[PDB]
Amino acid sequence: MKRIPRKTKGKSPATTEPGTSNREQYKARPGIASVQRATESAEMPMKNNDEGTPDKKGNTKGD
């Protein structure tokens, strides 16, 4: 058994392989950080538009 918390309120021998050496000299172009920053803002879903719809009590909420 495992526990997963909710996110919203509810009803309540030698081993050194001859190729694993790290000799990196490549700089990404465009850089990883910049495009990652942009696409992270791209990930966000569009905002909710709740205005004009009723609530659990039955009164429409908004202005």
């Binding site: 000299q25 490549y26 700089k27 172009r29």
Partner: protein
């Protein structure tokens, strides 16, 4: 002698020991141009001795 083939367009070459192969022709062309330009001289007569 790598540095003589990376002085035209190797601006993105991070490594100091490396060079981009795809600009070899351009670098060689510039090298040949300098080779020609550096030799534009007239041979002078100095003097002799038996």
């Amino acid at each position: 002698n790598i540095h003589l083939f990376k002085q035209l367009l190797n601006t993105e070459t991070l490594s100091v020991r490396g060079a981009n192969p795809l600009m070899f022709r351009a670098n060689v062309l510039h090298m040949l141009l300098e080779f020609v330009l550096d030799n534009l001289y007239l041979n002078r007569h100095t003097g002799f001795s038996q």
